[PDB]
């Protein structure tokens, strides 16, 4: 029985300082080195540094000399990374890892924490703008027809989207968030047969907690001009 | 600094077969004493990454019997025998020499080998509410294609445009294991009405002719 | 038996219980101070481990590489210099705590022993006289000093070590649980085995002081009896037979000693094997635990050494508890003698103290029996009256009930039935001290106290002036000769000073009685042992002492008793007749019958003693060199394992490497076992052969040496048995076990020095100034653990002279009422060692505490300087730990070994003794084989003007111009006064001595030309008190003629002619009856007749009869005379005559005075001569 844990997700504004924690459970806490490692989205895996977890001896890498600080607490078996001078280029998932001190450098890393996601922002809370997406004016070519809905602007994550308050979920595709101009953009669509629309009611349903907006947007067939 | 190169980056596999992966250094991982150090790691989405094979050929207490690892010098390989419904994730490689910098490898997902399929396309111009707001965005959808590589290309009046691009790809579907992508570009209200010919191109391996889909502003 | 443990401290008192409490508190807070420094050691070695491991990890720091590694080791510097304060703190703590524990315990010991000893002597001096003559004064003499020393070493110091040992154990055990959990259980599962190892191993490490005396007892008994009977040995030859019997006993003892030594060595070797197996599998489990990432290295070191030291501290406690229980038995004996209630004190203050005592004495219906045999009655219905100032004389049958009168008037015994009264008042109702003060005794044999003449006198009364002493000496007719002494009244007398004659001693006793100024005077056979010339002046002094006093005299020889006022004849404890001399002579009863019957070291020689069996030394010294340089091997592989847990590498090589080291532990254990066994074996057997051959040869050379050597007071029986036993036991060591330990320590510490100077360079120069004080710590810790430095015993032995000298001369001191004088004199020579013990207690406490503190200090100093050495990247931690282990464990090893073998001083001076007396050549070699040894069986004896002085006192002459012939078959009689030299004739014909001038001829041949064994072979000695050996009748008789088959037929004829055949035929198991302390006790005359038979088997042509006063047998005496007359019928005979009846029938008489023959002739001629011999026969009238 061995387990590491980390805190919850983090939304932090620009220029502030944040603190992240790695809690150990189920082994001898006084032996193992603790290695802090980083992982951006869609890249390799960097290397923050490591500490002795017994007396606080630290060691860093050149790329991060001065953008971090390490502390430990032996009374509660916990490691902490304080993180200052925070900029935008540090929105990533951080991992903490264990290593045996008695024969390191020739032995792998045993276990890993579940990982923490840290998002860096600079804007303020913003309500979304929900737009419908109806096809171009023309004839119903095939039986399969697709209708869409955009959600533009908003901050921060997440937002819950349903179709007709979750009436059906056949052919539902929900793309993840896309970032631009420290704001977000999301889209979705669905496909049904030609004997459904506009004979029934299709309505995109958006729920944003931070702005507390539970907005319904019903699509309509596209006009001629 | 010991850079590394791993292949293949995204490989397909069926059920209950063999699947091999290769990791290549640039230095020599052979230490002075007779050892070569690798540490093959498995990583599932969300959960924490496990340890799988350490020191090339050995195993770890609590692993199944299906995993082997062999190689020498500056070239190594891991082999999966009888791939189950549980080993789906990202495998990644490790290295030997400490500072600097004690670095790792990229990663490799796993694909379920579906029969090929050409995507379905759709175009969506903005709405009158979106035009009334001022900024408007053109949307192109592609659905149910395989495999993951695809080439989207935007043209306005038969001319390239490489700014304001938004692209999004879904993850693997559970039921039929297909893919889907969506692209969107944002423009202001003045330059939109200047032009008519708006087209998305979908170039894919299943054919030689790219899927060209266009529209103008006026016709119905 | 017990006491029990509550009543052990019965004489505690006010504040020594406070010392007990504070002392046990100090012991508890001292014992706990050792495991916690092992905890600190674990933590600091964990610090070095982490720092070294981290710096060994990263090393490619290029560029700008120097400053961060030096910062790491700066963290090392400060995080190490924080712990030296902890070390020095527990140093100061252990200093003061150890001081107070040792000082307080030993101080309480002293203040209790003082009281218990004074009260013990007060108890012994205050006793019923009947309790004596039953418990053998010889045992009771040694009991006080030996047994109270035995309780001294048992109640004071050892139990403090016991408490601190239990505290160390519980501290180590709790510090084992609080830091580790699993490993304490496996070490506890192994714990009882190595606990037994160290326990019984320390039990055998102790002593080895007198365990070899236990299996030796038989040959010791043979030696003590033959050396107590040399006078009857040498006169009958018999060197070969006694030597061979002693040889048999010694051989059996040798074999059993070999066996016991081999078994002990097996035990100790098994102890080593078990302890190294424990280390082996313990580090095996520890390594296979740490490599899985469970504990650290500090935890395994901490918990392992903690539980190990706990087990050791349990193993070092059994000698304390066994000495304690042994002191509990000693306390049973002592407290039994103390808590007794003597009923007839003699010290109490109850009875009356009547003044102006007239002296009317009365016995009224007295029935008495001694407490030895209540069944036989000695006195039955005795009635007697003695009027004031009158003189009564009690005579009759010896042993009947005469001396009982004197022993009842002093109220030495209570009579069962009847009443003894003084002036009409019962004797049991007056104060006994004042009773014995108003009475003066004059015992049979006079005693003198080994002090000055003055102190002998005012033992009569302490507050006597010197003028009163002069007047009392003038009344006892003792003045004129005392003025002739060298130191007048300050002449030292007794066992220690100059020997006085019997009459002089008796007159000094008279003077003791006279200054007491008694109203009643008792004379218990006042002149039986004195001759006819010494008795006259003593009788004048006694007649002067009787004037105006009531007197009862118990004495044989009814001569001058004629002038007494009234006589009483006893017969079966009853007065049959009473009246004046002329009246009992006319009565023709018992009285008349008696009256009418009368009328440098040299070490090369010490090693050269053992030139016979050198190959044992060769193989033993080789395997002792091997067992010397195999102590640092443990140190170096220990450093290698603790070091290989402080670097970085592949795990598999680490595990395999540690596995190899552990199996190497076990291999070294095996090798230590076998070499240790055969080493101890060969040295032990060499020692046993050396002591057997040396003891044999010294006993031989003692038997060869003549008689003059047996009169030096430093050469007595106990002195010589002590000399051979103890000195052989000491000389076995100065060649036995010294070479092994000196080569082992030089090999050990030299290997340590070299294996240090190879790896480390700096630290060894520091530790070479550290090794002497910890080397002192080893030997002083072993002094305090063995308690050998406590036993010095010099002023104690300078004081015990008065104790022995007061206890073995008891009847006179208790009849002179001196108990406050001897206790007052016993206070001072005891209070000096009191203050000496105080000073010794304080100095010993401060020394032990100081050496412990210096240990714990240099510990920290060494580790801090070693921390600076590893700071500048020029020495690995393996090397500092290696050289520290080498030097420190080398000093601990030289401490543990350097005081397990015996010392040096008493060993080499014992060798001086042994070689001095084995080289001592006898003047008159008996063991010689040359001499004429003719075939002439005549027996013509002739002394021609012999001149002789006893070489013990060459100043006094004894024989000068003594000439006399003895023809074949007739009888020569030798008589004279005191110091005439009659007994010297028997000793010169035996050739016990040579004369300075003159010559002694046998059959016209000088005896100096004859073979001594032959001369003594044709002589039949008959000593005064016949010595009998602890064996059967047949063997004691056959001991006369030596080297002969002697069958059943030859014994009975000799037994017949000695007039013991008839008496033996009725004894249980006729001639096979074992005689001695175990078998039947024969009367004195019967012993003499056995001696006569022993002389008869030899069939000599000369017979020497050295018999004299007195005679109490009244039945066996006449039969002895029958046998004596039977032996002289056809043999040349020389008689040392003191009885006047035997001499009238001799063929020739010689009267000797001052070594000159004053007159000679037959009985009738020397009677008509009317000279000296006529004066002797007129006395018995
Ligand atoms: C390149 C160099 C290579 C060197 C190779 C040669 C190595 C030489 C060292 C060999 C070992 C020394 C052997 C000593 C023999 C001692 C034998 C002995 O009996 O010791 C006993 C003694 C006390 O024991 P105890 O019970 O009292 O004896 C009975 C007394 N009745 O116990 C003692 O008190 C003995 C104490 C002696 C130790 C002090 C000296 C240690 C040697 C190092 C010298 C440097 C230290 C001194 C520094 C100052 C010098 C100026
Ligand atoms: C600048 C420097 O010290 N580089 C060393 C390099 O010289 C050495 O060849 C290598 C071997 O481990 O480690 C690193
Ligand atoms: C910060 C610093 O002093 N770095 C020096 C570097 O400037 C120099 O070029 C190199 C040459 O040996 O050694 C190192
Ligand atoms: C105690 C110590 O030496 N600390 C040094 C620091 O002075 C130095 O500036 C740095 C190298 O850049 O590494 C670390």
Short mmCIF file of N, CA and C in Angstrom, two decimals, chain A residues 35 37 39 43-47 50 59-61 63 95 99 104-114 130-139 144 146-150 152 173-176 178 180 185 187-189 191 217 222-225, chain B residues 31 33 37 39 41 43 46-51 54-55 60 92 96-106 122-130 133 135 137 139 141-144 164 166-170 180-182 184 186 215 218-220:
data_model
loop_
_atom_site.label_atom_id
_atom_site.label_comp_id
_atom_site.label_asym_id
_atom_site.label_seq_id
_atom_site.Cartn_x
_atom_site.Cartn_y
_atom_site.Cartn_z
N UNK A 35 11.34 14.35 -6.44
CA UNK A 35 11.63 15.02 -7.71
C UNK A 35 10.38 15.74 -8.18
N UNK A 37 8.68 17.48 -11.35
CA UNK A 37 8.75 17.51 -12.80
C UNK A 37 7.51 18.20 -13.35
N UNK A 39 5.07 19.24 -17.05
CA UNK A 39 4.65 18.76 -18.36
C UNK A 39 3.70 19.78 -18.97
N UNK A 43 4.15 18.55 -25.40
CA UNK A 43 5.60 18.65 -25.47
C UNK A 43 6.19 17.46 -24.73
N UNK A 44 7.49 17.54 -24.43
CA UNK A 44 8.18 16.50 -23.68
C UNK A 44 7.88 16.64 -22.20
N UNK A 45 8.80 16.19 -21.35
CA UNK A 45 8.71 16.39 -19.90
C UNK A 45 9.99 17.03 -19.41
N UNK A 46 9.86 18.21 -18.79
CA UNK A 46 11.00 19.00 -18.32
C UNK A 46 11.61 18.40 -17.06
N UNK A 47 12.13 19.25 -16.18
CA UNK A 47 12.67 18.79 -14.90
C UNK A 47 12.78 20.00 -13.98
N UNK A 50 14.94 18.73 -7.49
CA UNK A 50 14.67 17.74 -6.46
C UNK A 50 15.14 18.22 -5.10
N UNK A 59 18.23 21.04 -5.13
CA UNK A 59 19.01 21.20 -6.35
C UNK A 59 18.07 21.48 -7.52
N UNK A 60 18.46 22.44 -8.34
CA UNK A 60 17.66 22.97 -9.44
C UNK A 60 18.32 22.65 -10.77
N UNK A 61 17.65 23.04 -11.84
CA UNK A 61 18.21 23.04 -13.18
C UNK A 61 18.41 24.49 -13.62
N UNK A 63 17.37 26.08 -16.35
CA UNK A 63 16.22 26.75 -16.95
C UNK A 63 15.30 27.38 -15.93
N UNK A 95 3.90 17.15 -11.83
CA UNK A 95 3.97 15.85 -11.18
C UNK A 95 5.06 15.86 -10.11
N UNK A 99 11.96 8.82 -5.09
CA UNK A 99 13.18 8.08 -5.47
C UNK A 99 13.88 7.57 -4.22
N UNK A 104 20.16 5.74 -5.45
CA UNK A 104 19.63 6.48 -6.57
C UNK A 104 20.54 6.45 -7.79
N UNK A 105 20.15 7.22 -8.80
CA UNK A 105 20.87 7.39 -10.06
C UNK A 105 20.95 6.10 -10.87
N UNK A 106 20.72 4.95 -10.24
CA UNK A 106 20.75 3.68 -10.95
C UNK A 106 19.45 2.90 -10.75
N UNK A 107 18.38 3.57 -10.34
CA UNK A 107 17.13 2.92 -10.02
C UNK A 107 16.01 3.84 -10.51
N UNK A 108 14.94 3.29 -11.05
CA UNK A 108 13.88 4.14 -11.62
C UNK A 108 13.12 4.93 -10.58
N UNK A 109 12.17 5.74 -11.03
CA UNK A 109 11.22 6.38 -10.13
C UNK A 109 10.06 5.43 -9.87
N UNK A 110 9.75 5.21 -8.59
CA UNK A 110 8.77 4.19 -8.23
C UNK A 110 7.35 4.62 -8.57
N UNK A 111 6.84 5.65 -7.91
CA UNK A 111 5.44 6.01 -8.03
C UNK A 111 5.30 7.50 -8.26
N UNK A 112 4.08 7.90 -8.63
CA UNK A 112 3.80 9.22 -9.16
C UNK A 112 2.48 9.72 -8.60
N UNK A 113 2.38 11.03 -8.41
CA UNK A 113 1.13 11.62 -8.00
C UNK A 113 0.15 11.72 -9.15
N UNK A 114 -1.12 11.97 -8.82
CA UNK A 114 -2.12 12.07 -9.87
C UNK A 114 -1.98 13.34 -10.69
N UNK A 130 -23.53 32.95 -26.66
CA UNK A 130 -23.92 31.67 -27.23
C UNK A 130 -24.56 31.92 -28.59
N UNK A 131 -24.00 31.31 -29.63
CA UNK A 131 -24.49 31.54 -30.98
C UNK A 131 -24.98 30.24 -31.60
N UNK A 132 -26.07 30.26 -32.36
CA UNK A 132 -26.50 29.06 -33.08
C UNK A 132 -25.81 28.93 -34.43
N UNK A 133 -25.88 27.72 -35.00
CA UNK A 133 -25.20 27.40 -36.25
C UNK A 133 -26.14 26.54 -37.10
N UNK A 134 -26.82 27.19 -38.05
CA UNK A 134 -27.74 26.62 -39.01
C UNK A 134 -27.08 26.53 -40.38
N UNK A 135 -27.45 25.54 -41.19
CA UNK A 135 -26.76 25.33 -42.48
C UNK A 135 -26.98 26.45 -43.48
N UNK A 136 -26.32 26.34 -44.63
CA UNK A 136 -26.51 27.31 -45.70
C UNK A 136 -27.85 27.07 -46.38
N UNK A 137 -28.44 28.14 -46.91
CA UNK A 137 -29.72 28.03 -47.60
C UNK A 137 -29.59 27.17 -48.85
N UNK A 138 -30.43 26.14 -48.94
CA UNK A 138 -30.39 25.24 -50.07
C UNK A 138 -31.33 24.07 -49.86
N UNK A 139 -31.14 23.05 -50.68
CA UNK A 139 -31.96 21.85 -50.62
C UNK A 139 -31.37 20.84 -49.65
N UNK A 144 -28.76 12.57 -43.81
CA UNK A 144 -28.00 12.99 -42.64
C UNK A 144 -27.83 14.51 -42.66
N UNK A 146 -26.77 18.00 -40.13
CA UNK A 146 -25.97 18.36 -38.97
C UNK A 146 -26.26 19.80 -38.56
N UNK A 147 -26.48 20.01 -37.26
CA UNK A 147 -26.74 21.32 -36.70
C UNK A 147 -25.72 21.60 -35.60
N UNK A 148 -25.32 22.87 -35.45
CA UNK A 148 -24.23 23.21 -34.55
C UNK A 148 -24.57 24.37 -33.63
N UNK A 149 -23.71 24.54 -32.63
CA UNK A 149 -23.81 25.66 -31.70
C UNK A 149 -22.41 26.08 -31.26
N UNK A 150 -22.14 27.37 -31.36
CA UNK A 150 -20.91 27.96 -30.83
C UNK A 150 -21.15 28.56 -29.46
N UNK A 152 -18.82 31.45 -27.50
CA UNK A 152 -17.68 32.32 -27.80
C UNK A 152 -17.38 33.22 -26.61
N UNK A 173 -20.90 15.41 -30.42
CA UNK A 173 -19.47 15.64 -30.40
C UNK A 173 -19.21 16.95 -29.66
N UNK A 174 -18.39 16.89 -28.62
CA UNK A 174 -18.09 18.05 -27.78
C UNK A 174 -16.58 18.28 -27.80
N UNK A 175 -16.14 19.23 -28.62
CA UNK A 175 -14.72 19.52 -28.71
C UNK A 175 -14.24 20.21 -27.44
N UNK A 176 -12.99 19.98 -27.04
CA UNK A 176 -12.44 20.70 -25.89
C UNK A 176 -12.25 22.18 -26.17
N UNK A 178 -10.68 25.89 -26.86
CA UNK A 178 -9.63 26.49 -27.68
C UNK A 178 -9.36 27.89 -27.15
N UNK A 180 -7.69 31.75 -27.29
CA UNK A 180 -7.18 32.85 -28.10
C UNK A 180 -7.47 34.16 -27.39
N UNK A 185 -13.00 29.64 -26.52
CA UNK A 185 -13.93 29.38 -27.61
C UNK A 185 -14.21 27.88 -27.63
N UNK A 187 -17.08 24.79 -29.41
CA UNK A 187 -18.12 24.52 -30.38
C UNK A 187 -18.68 23.13 -30.13
N UNK A 188 -19.84 22.87 -30.72
CA UNK A 188 -20.40 21.53 -30.68
C UNK A 188 -21.38 21.38 -31.83
N UNK A 189 -21.71 20.14 -32.15
CA UNK A 189 -22.65 19.86 -33.23
C UNK A 189 -23.26 18.49 -33.00
N UNK A 191 -25.79 15.33 -35.41
CA UNK A 191 -26.32 14.91 -36.70
C UNK A 191 -27.49 13.97 -36.48
N UNK A 217 -30.77 28.47 -26.10
CA UNK A 217 -30.71 29.05 -27.44
C UNK A 217 -31.28 28.04 -28.42
N UNK A 222 -32.15 28.82 -41.61
CA UNK A 222 -31.50 30.01 -42.14
C UNK A 222 -32.41 30.73 -43.13
N UNK A 223 -32.47 32.05 -43.01
CA UNK A 223 -33.22 32.86 -43.94
C UNK A 223 -32.49 33.04 -45.25
N UNK A 224 -33.20 33.58 -46.24
CA UNK A 224 -32.56 33.78 -47.55
C UNK A 224 -31.47 34.84 -47.53
N UNK A 225 -31.69 35.94 -46.80
CA UNK A 225 -30.69 36.99 -46.69
C UNK A 225 -30.91 37.82 -45.43
N UNK B 31 26.80 2.19 -19.30
CA UNK B 31 27.61 2.71 -18.22
C UNK B 31 28.97 2.00 -18.20
N UNK B 33 30.43 0.15 -15.72
CA UNK B 33 30.08 -1.22 -15.39
C UNK B 33 28.96 -1.72 -16.31
N UNK B 37 20.55 1.38 -18.74
CA UNK B 37 19.42 1.77 -17.92
C UNK B 37 18.30 2.35 -18.77
N UNK B 39 13.75 2.74 -18.36
CA UNK B 39 12.67 2.63 -17.38
C UNK B 39 11.36 2.91 -18.12
N UNK B 41 7.70 3.41 -18.85
CA UNK B 41 6.57 3.84 -18.03
C UNK B 41 5.27 3.78 -18.82
N UNK B 43 1.21 5.23 -18.72
CA UNK B 43 0.47 6.38 -18.23
C UNK B 43 -0.95 6.33 -18.78
N UNK B 46 -5.47 10.84 -16.73
CA UNK B 46 -6.01 11.22 -15.43
C UNK B 46 -5.36 10.59 -14.23
N UNK B 47 -5.17 9.27 -14.27
CA UNK B 47 -4.56 8.56 -13.16
C UNK B 47 -3.06 8.83 -13.12
N UNK B 48 -2.39 8.20 -12.20
CA UNK B 48 -0.97 8.48 -12.14
C UNK B 48 -0.19 7.45 -12.95
N UNK B 49 0.93 7.86 -13.55
CA UNK B 49 1.73 6.91 -14.34
C UNK B 49 2.37 5.85 -13.46
N UNK B 50 2.37 4.62 -13.95
CA UNK B 50 2.95 3.49 -13.25
C UNK B 50 4.37 3.23 -13.75
N UNK B 51 5.04 2.28 -13.11
CA UNK B 51 6.28 1.72 -13.61
C UNK B 51 5.98 0.37 -14.25
N UNK B 54 11.93 -1.99 -15.84
CA UNK B 54 13.14 -1.25 -15.51
C UNK B 54 14.36 -2.12 -15.76
N UNK B 55 15.45 -1.46 -16.17
CA UNK B 55 16.70 -2.12 -16.55
C UNK B 55 16.46 -3.12 -17.68
N UNK B 60 8.82 -5.78 -12.80
CA UNK B 60 8.53 -5.15 -11.53
C UNK B 60 7.46 -5.94 -10.80
N UNK B 92 6.08 5.87 -22.18
CA UNK B 92 7.21 6.76 -22.41
C UNK B 92 8.49 6.23 -21.77
N UNK B 96 19.60 7.54 -18.51
CA UNK B 96 20.55 7.03 -17.52
C UNK B 96 21.30 8.12 -16.77
N UNK B 97 21.99 9.01 -17.48
CA UNK B 97 22.93 9.93 -16.85
C UNK B 97 22.19 11.07 -16.16
N UNK B 98 22.53 11.32 -14.89
CA UNK B 98 22.05 12.52 -14.22
C UNK B 98 22.69 13.79 -14.75
N UNK B 99 22.68 14.84 -13.92
CA UNK B 99 22.70 16.23 -14.37
C UNK B 99 23.87 16.53 -15.31
N UNK B 100 23.62 17.28 -16.39
CA UNK B 100 22.25 17.61 -16.78
C UNK B 100 21.76 16.74 -17.94
N UNK B 101 20.44 16.65 -18.14
CA UNK B 101 19.38 17.08 -17.22
C UNK B 101 18.52 15.93 -16.68
N UNK B 102 18.82 14.68 -17.02
CA UNK B 102 18.01 13.52 -16.63
C UNK B 102 16.60 13.63 -17.24
N UNK B 103 16.56 13.56 -18.57
CA UNK B 103 15.36 13.84 -19.35
C UNK B 103 14.68 12.55 -19.80
N UNK B 104 13.44 12.70 -20.26
CA UNK B 104 12.57 11.59 -20.64
C UNK B 104 12.30 11.61 -22.14
N UNK B 105 11.25 10.89 -22.56
CA UNK B 105 10.87 10.80 -23.95
C UNK B 105 9.46 11.32 -24.19
N UNK B 106 9.08 11.32 -25.46
CA UNK B 106 7.82 11.88 -25.89
C UNK B 106 6.59 11.18 -25.35
N UNK B 122 -19.09 19.62 -43.57
CA UNK B 122 -20.19 20.57 -43.47
C UNK B 122 -19.64 21.98 -43.29
N UNK B 123 -20.37 22.96 -43.82
CA UNK B 123 -19.98 24.36 -43.76
C UNK B 123 -21.06 25.14 -43.03
N UNK B 124 -20.63 26.10 -42.20
CA UNK B 124 -21.56 26.98 -41.49
C UNK B 124 -21.08 28.42 -41.53
N UNK B 125 -21.78 29.28 -42.25
CA UNK B 125 -21.52 30.72 -42.18
C UNK B 125 -22.09 31.30 -40.90
N UNK B 126 -21.65 32.49 -40.50
CA UNK B 126 -22.14 33.08 -39.25
C UNK B 126 -23.63 33.39 -39.32
N UNK B 127 -24.17 33.80 -38.17
CA UNK B 127 -25.58 34.12 -38.02
C UNK B 127 -25.77 35.63 -37.88
N UNK B 128 -27.00 36.07 -38.15
CA UNK B 128 -27.30 37.50 -38.15
C UNK B 128 -27.07 38.12 -36.78
N UNK B 129 -27.26 37.35 -35.70
CA UNK B 129 -26.91 37.84 -34.37
C UNK B 129 -25.40 38.07 -34.27
N UNK B 130 -24.61 37.14 -34.81
CA UNK B 130 -23.16 37.26 -34.75
C UNK B 130 -22.67 38.42 -35.62
N UNK B 133 -23.37 41.58 -33.73
CA UNK B 133 -22.39 41.86 -32.69
C UNK B 133 -21.14 42.53 -33.25
N UNK B 135 -18.22 40.99 -34.85
CA UNK B 135 -17.26 39.98 -35.26
C UNK B 135 -17.98 38.70 -35.65
N UNK B 137 -17.57 34.58 -37.58
CA UNK B 137 -16.65 33.47 -37.73
C UNK B 137 -17.23 32.40 -38.63
N UNK B 139 -17.20 28.49 -40.00
CA UNK B 139 -17.02 27.21 -39.33
C UNK B 139 -17.05 26.09 -40.37
N UNK B 141 -16.90 21.74 -40.37
CA UNK B 141 -16.92 20.49 -39.62
C UNK B 141 -16.49 19.32 -40.50
N UNK B 142 -15.76 18.37 -39.90
CA UNK B 142 -15.42 17.11 -40.53
C UNK B 142 -15.66 16.00 -39.52
N UNK B 143 -16.26 14.90 -39.97
CA UNK B 143 -16.71 13.86 -39.05
C UNK B 143 -16.37 12.47 -39.57
N UNK B 144 -16.12 11.56 -38.63
CA UNK B 144 -16.09 10.11 -38.88
C UNK B 144 -15.02 9.72 -39.89
N UNK B 164 -5.66 33.61 -37.56
CA UNK B 164 -6.96 33.44 -36.93
C UNK B 164 -7.53 32.05 -37.06
N UNK B 166 -8.57 28.35 -35.89
CA UNK B 166 -8.92 27.57 -34.71
C UNK B 166 -9.19 26.14 -35.15
N UNK B 167 -8.47 25.19 -34.56
CA UNK B 167 -8.60 23.79 -34.90
C UNK B 167 -8.85 22.99 -33.63
N UNK B 168 -9.69 21.96 -33.74
CA UNK B 168 -9.95 21.11 -32.59
C UNK B 168 -10.22 19.69 -33.07
N UNK B 169 -9.56 18.72 -32.44
CA UNK B 169 -9.75 17.31 -32.72
C UNK B 169 -10.29 16.61 -31.49
N UNK B 170 -11.28 15.74 -31.69
CA UNK B 170 -11.81 14.95 -30.59
C UNK B 170 -10.84 13.84 -30.22
N UNK B 180 -13.15 13.08 -35.46
CA UNK B 180 -13.89 14.25 -35.90
C UNK B 180 -13.06 15.49 -35.60
N UNK B 181 -13.09 16.46 -36.51
CA UNK B 181 -12.40 17.72 -36.30
C UNK B 181 -13.31 18.88 -36.66
N UNK B 182 -12.95 20.05 -36.15
CA UNK B 182 -13.69 21.27 -36.43
C UNK B 182 -12.74 22.45 -36.49
N UNK B 184 -12.42 26.87 -37.39
CA UNK B 184 -13.16 28.12 -37.35
C UNK B 184 -12.21 29.30 -37.49
N UNK B 186 -12.08 33.74 -37.52
CA UNK B 186 -12.77 34.93 -37.04
C UNK B 186 -12.32 36.15 -37.85
N UNK B 215 -18.56 28.13 -50.73
CA UNK B 215 -19.83 28.84 -50.83
C UNK B 215 -19.55 30.29 -51.19
N UNK B 218 -24.53 34.98 -51.63
CA UNK B 218 -25.84 35.42 -52.08
C UNK B 218 -26.79 34.29 -52.46
N UNK B 219 -26.29 33.21 -53.06
CA UNK B 219 -27.16 32.21 -53.65
C UNK B 219 -27.84 31.36 -52.58
N UNK B 220 -28.98 30.78 -52.97
CA UNK B 220 -29.71 29.83 -52.14
C UNK B 220 -30.25 28.68 -52.98
#
